[PDB]
Scaffold this active site. Structure first.
Site, mmCIF file in Angstrom:
data_model
loop_
_atom_site.group_PDB
_atom_site.id
_atom_site.type_symbol
_atom_site.label_atom_id
_atom_site.label_comp_id
_atom_site.label_asym_id
_atom_site.label_seq_id
_atom_site.Cartn_x
_atom_site.Cartn_y
_atom_site.Cartn_z
ATOM 1 N N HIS B 74 -37.748 29.809 -1.804
ATOM 2 C CA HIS B 74 -36.451 30.409 -2.133
ATOM 3 C C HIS B 74 -36.615 31.907 -2.413
ATOM 4 C CE1 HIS B 74 -35.456 26.098 -2.728
ATOM 5 N NE2 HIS B 74 -34.342 26.498 -2.147
ATOM 6 N N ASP B 115 -29.072 32.605 -2.623
ATOM 7 C CA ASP B 115 -30.155 32.126 -3.482
ATOM 8 C C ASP B 115 -30.793 33.239 -4.319
ATOM 9 O OD1 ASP B 115 -30.271 29.328 -3.182
ATOM 10 O OD2 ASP B 115 -31.477 29.479 -1.361
HETATM 11 O O1 LIG Z 1 -35.066 20.370 -1.404
HETATM 12 C C1 LIG Z 1 -34.099 21.084 -1.460
HETATM 13 O O2 LIG Z 1 -33.241 21.015 -2.529
HETATM 14 C C2 LIG Z 1 -32.209 21.919 -2.311
HETATM 15 C C3 LIG Z 1 -31.124 22.100 -3.136
HETATM 16 C C4 LIG Z 1 -30.140 22.999 -2.737
HETATM 17 O O3 LIG Z 1 -29.064 23.185 -3.552
HETATM 18 C C5 LIG Z 1 -30.262 23.695 -1.535
HETATM 19 C C6 LIG Z 1 -31.369 23.496 -0.725
HETATM 20 C C7 LIG Z 1 -32.368 22.598 -1.108
HETATM 21 C C8 LIG Z 1 -33.587 22.096 -0.505
HETATM 22 C C9 LIG Z 1 -34.019 22.632 0.648
HETATM 23 C C10 LIG Z 1 -35.110 22.259 1.553
HETATM 24 C C11 LIG Z 1 -35.328 23.051 2.679
HETATM 25 C C12 LIG Z 1 -36.278 22.714 3.626
HETATM 26 C C13 LIG Z 1 -37.036 21.565 3.459
HETATM 27 O O4 LIG Z 1 -37.958 21.120 4.379
HETATM 28 C C14 LIG Z 1 -38.322 21.899 5.445
HETATM 29 F F1 LIG Z 1 -37.288 22.056 6.301
HETATM 30 F F2 LIG Z 1 -38.776 23.113 5.063
HETATM 31 C C15 LIG Z 1 -36.832 20.752 2.326
HETATM 32 O O5 LIG Z 1 -37.587 19.605 2.257
HETATM 33 C C16 LIG Z 1 -37.759 18.960 0.962
HETATM 34 C C17 LIG Z 1 -36.593 18.032 0.643
HETATM 35 C C18 LIG Z 1 -36.914 16.769 1.417
HETATM 36 C C19 LIG Z 1 -38.430 16.679 1.485
HETATM 37 C C20 LIG Z 1 -38.984 18.043 1.094
HETATM 38 C C21 LIG Z 1 -35.877 21.105 1.386
HETATM 39 MG MG LIG Z 2 -29.560 27.416 -3.138
HETATM 40 ZN ZN LIG Z 3 -30.860 28.290 0.208
#
Ligand SMILES: O=C1Oc2cc(O)ccc2/C1=C/c1ccc(OC(F)F)c(OC2CCCC2)c1
Ligand SMILES: [Mg+2]
Ligand SMILES: [Zn+2]
Ligand SMILES: O=C1Oc2cc(O)ccc2/C1=C/c1ccc(OC(F)F)c(OC2CCCC2)c1
Ligand SMILES: [Mg+2]
Ligand SMILES: [Zn+2]
Lengths: 321, 324
Positions: B74, B115
């Site tokens: 982030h 963010d």
């Molecule tokens: O986990 C998260 O909680 C959030 C909460 C928010 O409010 C916004 C964005 C996210 C968010 C984003 C996110 C982005 C990319 C991910 O994987 C890859 F594409 F890089 C990712 O994977 C995690 C979640 C599932 C397994 C690992 C998570």
């Molecule tokens: Mg966010």
């Molecule tokens: Zn974001």
């Protein structure tokens, strides 16, 4: 002493809250909360040390502004004591746990804390720090919550220190849900949902209303503190008229700051073109009576005297026109 | 020169799969500033809204500074990526001439700030640890309220008000649209947001030119809310070498939050236990239960504009699955 005597009315609608404010050294919130806690046995139930209760209540009261005519510690004490009465309506007898009772009373006590005496719309229009912090949504109400909870962290102020962590979690959520519902911009939706609950109401034999899920129970507590917030026109007229003088003083002081700034003067805040009396009748006809009419149904017949005083006061105000 | 190579890379700004990590290095860790400046010039936004170029650069650099350089996911690179992804999604044929310049400005600005000052831990963590942030915001969209408050506050710094020449109506409308968009990036809103977007797709109207018809604020903001939400959840739709770098970063962030939790005797949140994580299976479940249901619905809304993006997402899912 006379203070001790006035507090004997703590269970009565129309308590002499201005007297109690005078007789307590401008501590009506502290003394009325302390009395209501002792009356409800909440210090023992929740193992609140009395010195911690008193310390917190005085810090809380200190964060109500003494130079704000309506949204001050006297209004806080009044909403507290009003909620305390509505919790004991027969048609709600022990509907709510001791935690839900602690939640509605605590939320009542903090629900306007650190109020600056201007509306959310004023705070938005003046590009205030508060509106910038809270993204224009329930700006005051989010602030009241944040201050009320923050003061728990001062020395010997954590009145919830002997609650379990899940009790504290549950209490925190209920208080937030209740105080956010005092925002008058949520009034109409709150009332629609209260009406819905009335027409699908369910009752025991002795009369106690039946609410099964949290959703309905918090919604009643939201409307209850909302009613207590909007209970000035249901009090004895001598009380109501002083509430009216204070809110009009607060509105006019806002409209003076709007005039100073060359801002457009908000409704009923122009001290040069007001009609206090016609405004109260409209307030009653369009906000306060529709609300208390729906609440009286929900707790039929325990609110009849309250509703009676409201209709008497509306007739009087109309007769001054 | 690094500048020649940087400018070459910035010619890809209209393409899905921009080399955003190369741009971050080529630009001296200024991906958000250079990509935003490129997009504003590409869309003629400085002229349309009378934005002084030095004011735009000054705000962008200050905004970029307030992303944490020590947060793995982030950070400013994520913000640049969501800006650029939103910029591509705005240009989809099904939305031609739909949105005003002010709405486009709102969606891009919201993506840039969405963010900012993220500390690298979730809303639930901030609630559970009694943080100042959660106390300030009463446990409700704690981070997202904060991102908005910071993003708007920085406009008041010296020579930073990029909206100085908008009318009051324009500023008021832009401010509300930006708030509505950023608050919708809160993942706890996703299910309701997706449910509403499905309803819109099932009842959608198009014009005689074949473009989406949006009658009212509620429908227009709903589309912009889901557009930026899709851009926020676009990592699994990107070419695999980009997607994998995003996964490495989110996992490091998760693991670093789980370290703090395991210290405090708190139960580690799902996927934050480096001693018991399953990276590949978690990505497959992320796509299956969140990212693909969203992107399949967006693809339906703009059909067939997003077919290559949806195809990439499905291939990437197949790939991560094959590594189990
Ligand atoms: O986990 C998260 O909680 C959030 C909460 C928010 O409010 C916004 C964005 C996210 C968010 C984003 C996110 C982005 C990319 C991910 O994987 C890859 F594409 F890089 C990712 O994977 C995690 C979640 C599932 C397994 C690992 C998570
Ligand atoms: Mg966010
Ligand atoms: Zn974001
Ligand atoms: O006007 C208000 O805006 C609010 C906003 C909130 O969020 C909470 C409470 C109030 C609120 C309260 C209030 C309380 C008492 C009034 O009259 C009398 F009973 F004292 C009163 O009258 C006004 C409104 C119409 C005539 C003058 C208003
Ligand atoms: Mg209030
Ligand atoms: Zn109040």
């Amino acid at each position: 002493d006379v203070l001790a005597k006035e507090l004997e009315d703590v269970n009565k609608w129309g308590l002499h809250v201005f007297r109690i404010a005078e007789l307590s050294g401008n501590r009506p919130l502290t003394v009325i909360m302390h009395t209501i806690f002792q009356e409800r046995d909440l210090l023992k139930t929740f193992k609140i040390p009395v010195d911690t209760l008193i310390t917190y209540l005085m810090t809380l009261e200190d964060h109500y502004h003494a130079d704000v005519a309506y949204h001050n510690n006297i209004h806080a004490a009044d909403v507290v004591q009003s909620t305390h009465v509505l919790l004991s309506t027969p048609a709600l007898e022990a509907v709510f746990t001791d935690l839900e009772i602690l939640a509605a009373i605590f939320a009542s006590a903090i629900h306007d804390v650190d109020h600056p005496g201007v509306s959310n719309q004023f705070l938005i229009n003046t590009n205030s720090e508060l509106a910038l912090m809270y993204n224009d949504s329930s700006v005051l109400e989010n602030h009241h919550l944040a201050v009320g909870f923050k003061l728990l962290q001062e020395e010997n102020c954590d009145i919830f220190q002997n609650l379990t962590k899940k009790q504290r979690q549950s209490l925190r959520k209920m208080v937030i849900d209740i105080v956010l519902a005092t925002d008058m911009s949520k009034h109409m939706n709150l009332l629609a949902d209260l009406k819905t609950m009335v027409e699908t109401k369910k009752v025991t034999s002795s009369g106690v209303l039946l609410l099964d899920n949290y959703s309905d129970r918090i919604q009643v507590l939201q409307n209850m503190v909302h009613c207590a917030d909007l209970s000035n026109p249901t009090k004895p007229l001598q009380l109501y008229r002083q509430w009216t003088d204070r809110i009009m003083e607060e509105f006019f002081r806002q409209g003076d700051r709007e005039r100073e700034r060359g801002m457009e003067i908000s409704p009923m805040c122009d001290k040069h073109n007001a009609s206090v009396e016609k405004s109260q009748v409209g307030f009653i006809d369009y906000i306060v009576h529709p609300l208390w009419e729906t609440w009286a149904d929900l707790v039929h017949p325990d609110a009849q005297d309250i509703l009676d005083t409201l209709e008497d006061n509306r007739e009087w105000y109309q007769s001054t026109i």
